[PDB]
Design an enzyme around this catalytic site. Sequence first.
Site, PDB file in Angstrom:
ATOM      1  N   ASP A 118       0.851  -1.165   0.000  1.00 20.81           N
ATOM      2  CA  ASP A 118       0.000   0.000   0.000  1.00 20.81           C
ATOM      3  C   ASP A 118       0.899   1.230   0.000  1.00 20.81           C
ATOM      4  O   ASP A 118       1.620   1.495   0.973  1.00 20.81           O
ATOM      5  CB  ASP A 118      -0.899  -0.034   1.262  1.00 20.81           C
ATOM      6  CG  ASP A 118      -1.930   1.082   1.298  1.00 20.81           C
ATOM      7  OD1 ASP A 118      -1.783   2.095   0.584  1.00 20.81           O
ATOM      8  OD2 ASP A 118      -2.927   0.941   2.056  1.00 20.81           O
ATOM      9  N   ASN A 141      -5.327  12.965 -12.298  1.00 18.03           N
ATOM     10  CA  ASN A 141      -5.946  13.449 -13.536  1.00 18.03           C
ATOM     11  C   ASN A 141      -5.543  14.911 -13.724  1.00 18.03           C
ATOM     12  O   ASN A 141      -5.075  15.559 -12.788  1.00 18.03           O
ATOM     13  CB  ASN A 141      -7.470  13.280 -13.490  1.00 18.03           C
ATOM     14  CG  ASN A 141      -8.104  13.962 -12.287  1.00 18.03           C
ATOM     15  OD1 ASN A 141      -8.021  15.189 -12.131  1.00 18.03           O
ATOM     16  ND2 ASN A 141      -8.745  13.174 -11.430  1.00 18.03           N
ATOM     17  N   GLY A 184      -9.282   4.462  -7.423  1.00 16.21           N
ATOM     18  CA  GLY A 184      -7.983   3.834  -7.623  1.00 16.21           C
ATOM     19  C   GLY A 184      -6.929   4.304  -6.647  1.00 16.21           C
ATOM     20  O   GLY A 184      -7.237   4.684  -5.518  1.00 16.21           O
ATOM     21  N   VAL A 185      -5.671   4.304  -7.075  1.00 19.09           N
ATOM     22  CA  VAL A 185      -4.593   4.743  -6.173  1.00 19.09           C
ATOM     23  C   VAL A 185      -4.783   6.210  -5.779  1.00 19.09           C
ATOM     24  O   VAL A 185      -4.606   6.573  -4.612  1.00 19.09           O
ATOM     25  CB  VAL A 185      -3.185   4.523  -6.755  1.00 19.09           C
ATOM     26  CG1 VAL A 185      -2.160   5.032  -5.758  1.00 19.09           C
ATOM     27  CG2 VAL A 185      -2.951   3.039  -7.020  1.00 19.09           C
ATOM     28  N   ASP A 186      -5.182   7.050  -6.732  1.00 17.13           N
ATOM     29  CA  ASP A 186      -5.474   8.462  -6.439  1.00 17.13           C
ATOM     30  C   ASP A 186      -6.469   8.620  -5.284  1.00 17.13           C
ATOM     31  O   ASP A 186      -6.274   9.474  -4.391  1.00 17.13           O
ATOM     32  CB  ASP A 186      -5.995   9.169  -7.685  1.00 17.13           C
ATOM     33  CG  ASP A 186      -6.462  10.592  -7.420  1.00 17.13           C
ATOM     34  OD1 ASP A 186      -7.593  10.775  -6.897  1.00 17.13           O
ATOM     35  OD2 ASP A 186      -5.696  11.537  -7.738  1.00 17.13           O
ATOM     36  N   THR A 189      -2.182   2.463 -15.558  1.00 18.77           N
ATOM     37  CA  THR A 189      -2.649   1.075 -15.736  1.00 18.77           C
ATOM     38  C   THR A 189      -3.960   0.811 -14.960  1.00 18.77           C
ATOM     39  O   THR A 189      -4.394  -0.331 -14.832  1.00 18.77           O
ATOM     40  CB  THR A 189      -1.596   0.050 -15.293  1.00 18.77           C
ATOM     41  OG1 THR A 189      -1.383   0.135 -13.871  1.00 18.77           O
ATOM     42  CG2 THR A 189      -0.254   0.230 -16.067  1.00 18.77           C
ATOM     43  N   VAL A 197      -7.818   3.048 -14.620  1.00 17.79           N
ATOM     44  CA  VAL A 197      -8.893   3.381 -15.556  1.00 17.79           C
ATOM     45  C   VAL A 197      -8.372   3.993 -16.863  1.00 17.79           C
ATOM     46  O   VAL A 197      -9.085   4.028 -17.855  1.00 17.79           O
ATOM     47  CB  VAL A 197      -9.975   4.276 -14.910  1.00 17.79           C
ATOM     48  CG1 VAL A 197     -10.627   3.568 -13.710  1.00 17.79           C
ATOM     49  CG2 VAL A 197      -9.408   5.633 -14.526  1.00 17.79           C
TER      50      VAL A 197
END
Length: 189
Positions: free
Chosen positions: A20, A34, A42-44, A135, A137
């Site tokens: 993590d 973005n 996701g990770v964001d 890798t 969305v």
Amino acid sequence: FQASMKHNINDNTLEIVVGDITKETTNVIVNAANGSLLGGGGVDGAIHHAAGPELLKACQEMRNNELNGEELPTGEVIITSGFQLPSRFIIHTVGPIWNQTPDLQEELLANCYRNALELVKVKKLSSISFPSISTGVYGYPIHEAAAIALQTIIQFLQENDVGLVKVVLFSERDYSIYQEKLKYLIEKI
Ligand SMILES: [Cl-]
């Protein structure tokens, strides 16, 4: 259990690990953002949740001030505090969306890593963790993205003193691909 491998490149160290990224105690952690620097999944999403609400406010202040409302361009980076993350800083980057710009996208993905590592150098930090950029969305195939990430990072470490670079992957599957790709790349050196 969380798998890991390392390789020394001059006086730098490259480590790939399962884990993590929000729990990393490196000086810097990298967020796959973005262009709008708005919170997503996701990770964001994990990074925003671990960082606390000051991270979004900080990112939107930067957008409205130094970016003058503009989107962060693909491949480029900005830096903020880590806030409630265990790192000192977060470098935000925007990966390419798969096949939006076919003949530029390999170069653009590589720019994420290069621009982040150059910023580490400048700020005289000595440790940075990357997730797997684009890798999620954005759909960049992991076999191709992994090769670009590792080629770009190894290239940079061969040519510069940085310290420790970690690629931290939540997925054992992504990890398994990185392991074989890194081993392949090492054999070619
Ligand atoms: Cl194109």
